[PDB]
Write an enzyme that holds these catalytic residues in place. Structure first.
Site, mmCIF file in Angstrom:
data_model
loop_
_atom_site.group_PDB
_atom_site.id
_atom_site.type_symbol
_atom_site.label_atom_id
_atom_site.label_comp_id
_atom_site.label_asym_id
_atom_site.label_seq_id
_atom_site.Cartn_x
_atom_site.Cartn_y
_atom_site.Cartn_z
ATOM 1 N N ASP A 89 -41.357 -45.812 82.495
ATOM 2 C CA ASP A 89 -39.922 -46.071 82.435
ATOM 3 C C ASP A 89 -39.491 -46.380 81.011
ATOM 4 O O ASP A 89 -40.073 -47.244 80.349
ATOM 5 C CB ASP A 89 -39.550 -47.237 83.355
ATOM 6 C CG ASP A 89 -39.471 -46.831 84.834
ATOM 7 O OD1 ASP A 89 -39.251 -45.655 85.152
ATOM 8 O OD2 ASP A 89 -39.638 -47.699 85.691
ATOM 9 N N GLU B 98 -34.849 -46.026 83.989
ATOM 10 C CA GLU B 98 -35.610 -46.999 84.763
ATOM 11 C C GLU B 98 -35.504 -46.547 86.214
ATOM 12 O O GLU B 98 -34.413 -46.578 86.791
ATOM 13 C CB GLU B 98 -35.038 -48.406 84.592
ATOM 14 C CG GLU B 98 -35.120 -48.975 83.169
ATOM 15 C CD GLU B 98 -36.516 -49.463 82.842
ATOM 16 O OE1 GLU B 98 -37.273 -49.757 83.789
ATOM 17 O OE2 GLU B 98 -36.858 -49.543 81.652
ATOM 18 N N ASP C 30 -46.835 -46.189 79.222
ATOM 19 C CA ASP C 30 -45.832 -46.610 80.177
ATOM 20 C C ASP C 30 -44.949 -45.423 80.572
ATOM 21 O O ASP C 30 -44.825 -44.454 79.830
ATOM 22 C CB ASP C 30 -44.980 -47.702 79.537
ATOM 23 C CG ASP C 30 -43.942 -48.223 80.468
ATOM 24 O OD1 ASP C 30 -44.306 -48.403 81.639
ATOM 25 O OD2 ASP C 30 -42.781 -48.419 80.051
ATOM 26 N N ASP D 294 -42.468 -49.851 75.880
ATOM 27 C CA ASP D 294 -41.243 -50.473 75.407
ATOM 28 C C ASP D 294 -41.058 -51.897 75.897
ATOM 29 O O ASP D 294 -40.213 -52.613 75.348
ATOM 30 C CB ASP D 294 -40.026 -49.658 75.867
ATOM 31 C CG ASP D 294 -39.824 -49.740 77.383
ATOM 32 O OD1 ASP D 294 -40.762 -49.415 78.139
ATOM 33 O OD2 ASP D 294 -38.741 -50.150 77.825
ATOM 34 N N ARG E 196 -35.901 -57.150 92.807
ATOM 35 C CA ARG E 196 -35.150 -55.900 92.728
ATOM 36 C C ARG E 196 -35.475 -54.980 93.896
ATOM 37 O O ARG E 196 -34.575 -54.372 94.478
ATOM 38 C CB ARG E 196 -35.430 -55.199 91.402
ATOM 39 C CG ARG E 196 -34.910 -55.972 90.203
ATOM 40 C CD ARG E 196 -35.418 -55.362 88.906
ATOM 41 N NE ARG E 196 -36.828 -55.644 88.661
ATOM 42 C CZ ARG E 196 -37.553 -55.021 87.735
ATOM 43 N NH1 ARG E 196 -37.034 -54.075 86.980
ATOM 44 N NH2 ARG E 196 -38.833 -55.355 87.568
HETATM 45 N N1 LIG Z 1 -39.526 -51.046 83.689
HETATM 46 C C1 LIG Z 1 -39.801 -51.126 85.119
HETATM 47 C C2 LIG Z 1 -41.301 -51.022 85.362
HETATM 48 C C3 LIG Z 1 -41.777 -49.587 85.363
HETATM 49 P P1 LIG Z 1 -42.678 -49.192 83.786
HETATM 50 O O1 LIG Z 1 -43.818 -50.197 83.658
HETATM 51 O O2 LIG Z 1 -41.755 -49.389 82.595
HETATM 52 O O3 LIG Z 1 -43.126 -47.733 83.850
HETATM 53 C C4 LIG Z 1 -39.353 -52.465 85.704
HETATM 54 O O4 LIG Z 1 -38.755 -53.316 85.008
HETATM 55 O O5 LIG Z 1 -39.596 -52.733 86.901
HETATM 56 MG MG LIG Z 2 -41.120 -49.329 80.322
#
Ligand SMILES: N[C@@H](CCP(=O)(O)O)C(=O)O
Ligand SMILES: [Mg+2]
Length: 295
Positions: free
Chosen positions: A88, A95, A86, A243, A131
């Site tokens: 973020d 993020e 992953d 995460d 979002r």
């Molecule tokens: N955490 C982000 C998705 C991007 P990721 O899969 O963590 O690289 C979200 O809530 O939209």
């Molecule tokens: Mg993530």
């Protein structure tokens, strides 16, 4: 049929002292103790016949109150040939969607949705659409602005990726975020490939929508399956790390799945968790010594 336990500290809080490692190995009637990195990580071969749950409890009790992770696994096939990670909050500190939302003056509103999505309280796809909708009208220039000024790499990230590549592994950054970010981040860190969602723009501004079909939890599973097939292996040959709730599919499918500093409900569902170490923890999980690392 034989097991190994690995104890792992954060290199910035390297508390796994020699005496502590010996105490721990004594606590499981261990057959030896091997240091992968002084004060940071050591391997403890489990004596034959001990269930892994026993050793995990015994080691966690001995270490209680120290910031030292415990993982137990079979020694054979612990070094993997695929990394899927992953982005973020895993390979970067932020993020990407919350940082973009700041530029619309809506950081806190969007960040609260992100927390619920990453905890698994809302499905990924509706949360993303809600979002991203609020980013409508943002100038395309805002993406480089955010990347250049507010994105930072997670400690140990480059070393994890480069050291695995040095040993022939195939490494992929697979994200529910945006290609405009993953493409830059992936080449900063040194991944072989990236795959992410895509923001739609009219040429000058964001439309506030994402290209469908949205890549979510199941898309990460599918990408892991696609990668293993294309390189002639199986998902058992992969280590996956994230995460968030949208990572649990690939974490559960991979041969080694790591919940890294994960949301509370996420860590509760993972067989393997790292709460103190940084990304170098995944190198120690795989049995690498610090001498093996790309320094
Ligand atoms: N955490 C982000 C998705 C991007 P990721 O899969 O963590 O690289 C979200 O809530 O939209
Ligand atoms: Mg993530």
């Amino acid at each position: 049929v034989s097991l190994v336990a690995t104890l792992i500290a954060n290199p910035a809080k390297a508390a796994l002292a020699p005496s502590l490692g010996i105490k721990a190995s004594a606590a499981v009637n261990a057959t030896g103790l091997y240091w992968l990195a002084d004060d940071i990580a050591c391997d403890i071969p489990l004596p034959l016949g001990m269930e892994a749950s026993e050793a995990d409890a015994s080691l966690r009790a001995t270490l209680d109150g120290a910031p030292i992770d415990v993982v137990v696994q079979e020694q054979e096939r612990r070094r993997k040939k695929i990394l899927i990670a992953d982005m973020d909050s895993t390979m970067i500190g932020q993020e990407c969607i919350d940082e973009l939302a700041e530029e619309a003056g809506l950081r806190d509103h969007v960040a609260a949705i992100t927390a619920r999505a990453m905890n698994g309280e809302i499905a990924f796809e509706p949360a993303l659409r809600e979002r991203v909708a609020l980013l409508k009208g943002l100038p395309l220039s805002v993406i480089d602005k955010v990347i250049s000024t507010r994105i930072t790499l997670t400690p140990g990230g480059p070393q994890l990726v480069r050291t695995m590549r040095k040993h022939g592994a195939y490494t992929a950054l697979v994200s529910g975020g945006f290609t405009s970010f993953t493409r830059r981040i992936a080449e900063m860190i040194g991944f072989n490939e990236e795959r992410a969602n895509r923001l739609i723009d009219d040429g000058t501004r964001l439309t506030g929508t994402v290209a469908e079909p949205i890549l979510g939890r199941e898309a990460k599973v599918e990408k892991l399956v696609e990668i293993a097939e294309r390189v002639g292996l199986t998902p058992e040959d992969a280590i996956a790390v994230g995460d968030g709730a949208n990572d649990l599919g690939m974490i559960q499918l991979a041969g080694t799945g790591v919940a890294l500093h994960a949301k509370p409900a996420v860590a509760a569902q993972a067989k393997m968790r790292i709460d103190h170490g940084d990304l170098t923890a995944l190198l120690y999980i795989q049995g690498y010594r610090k001498a093996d690392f790309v320094q």
